[PDB]
């Protein structure tokens, strides 16, 4: 019972964390097999960060220009290549701890575990959601560039995020393990704003179902609604528009709880209109939306 915001066990990822330095710039990197991935801005001196030409900046480096370290032992860089906003440094040693893995670009609204690191050393793990506006509310990334986001399906690790920036508006922006940015952001020290954000309607419903599977029903009602009428309401409170696809997804949960997606929607509609009235749900005072239908099915069942 109980409903804790859980992060995947970090062991398999810890065994891949290293430190990468270039000049005076130091951050984290991912050592998989015989390669090390890290934000290409590691090669930027403070000044360069205002308007750097990575193509031109990288031409000036060599393999020995980079210093990668596994703990206190140094790994030797034999080759380097830039891929979008990342950097693929090839090394002589091979990480025997490299787990089974995949590189995956996740879709806004999904969740993942982040292993916060400082100087290639793991500091902590937390579960979070890829915000609709493509940023991640991770107040914890104060000098942890190169830290990664991931999911673990059985024994395979799916890396989906690499921290890159501290977008001055709080929150953080990153890249996928292929270097392509999440959101309209770039590798540069230039004022950028996080686009308008919305609440993740899909997840809030999954959350309500969780409270129901967990024995909570006070928020349910005698009504029902059509997708359209629901959106006309939810969209007033800044909620992501709900689509038939979202409804399908809630398929299993609905089956399990015996409550129709559209009925539950009628409940949410009421909650948005009448507030919670000092009442709580699954311990919260506000509606939670960083739990996917999958996370619910996964923790409420096993």
């Amino acid at each position: 019972s109980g409903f804790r915001k859980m992060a995947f066990p970090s062991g398999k990822v810890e065994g891949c964390m290293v430190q990468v330095t270039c000049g005076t710039t130091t951050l984290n990197g991912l050592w998989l097999d015989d390669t090390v991935y890290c934000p290409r801005h590691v090669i930027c001196t403070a000044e360069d960060m205002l308007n750097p030409n990575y193509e031109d900046l990288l031409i000036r480096k060599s393999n020995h220009s980079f210093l990668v370290q596994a703990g206190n032992v140094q790994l030797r860089v034999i080759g380097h290549s830039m891929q979008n906003c990342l950097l693929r440094l090839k090394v002589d040693t091979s990480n025997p701890k490299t787990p089974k893995y995949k590189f995956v670009r996740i879709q806004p609204g999904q969740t993942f575990s982040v292993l916060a690191c400082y100087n290639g050393s793991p500091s902590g793990v937390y579960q979070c959601a890829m915000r609709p506006n493509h940023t991640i509310k991770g107040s914890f990334l104060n000098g942890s560039c190169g830290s990664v986001g991931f999911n673990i399906d059985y024994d395979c690790v799916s890396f989906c995020y690499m921290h890159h920036m501290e977008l001055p508006t709080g929150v953080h922006a990153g890249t996928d393990l292929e270097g392509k940015f999440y959101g309209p952001f770039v590798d540069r020290q230039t004022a950028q704003a996080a686009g308008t954000d919305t609440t993740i309607t899909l997840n809030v419903l999954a959350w309500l179902y969780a409270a129901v599977i967990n024995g909570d029903r006070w928020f349910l009602n005698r009504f029902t609604t059509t997708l359209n009428d629901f959106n006309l309401v939810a969209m007033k409170y800044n909620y992501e528009p709900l689509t038939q696809d979202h409804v399908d997804i809630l398929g299993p949960l609905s089956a399990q709880t015996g409550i129709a997606v559209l009925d539950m929607c009628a409940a949410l509609k009421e909650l948005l209109q009448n507030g919670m009235n000092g009442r709580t749900i699954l311990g919260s005072t506000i509606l939670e939306d960083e739990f996917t239908p999958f996370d619910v099915v996964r923790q409420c069942s096993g």
Partner: peptide, 5 residues
């Protein structure tokens, strides 16, 4: 002023 590292 977007910050890195």
């Amino acid at each position: 002023n977007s910050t890195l590292q």
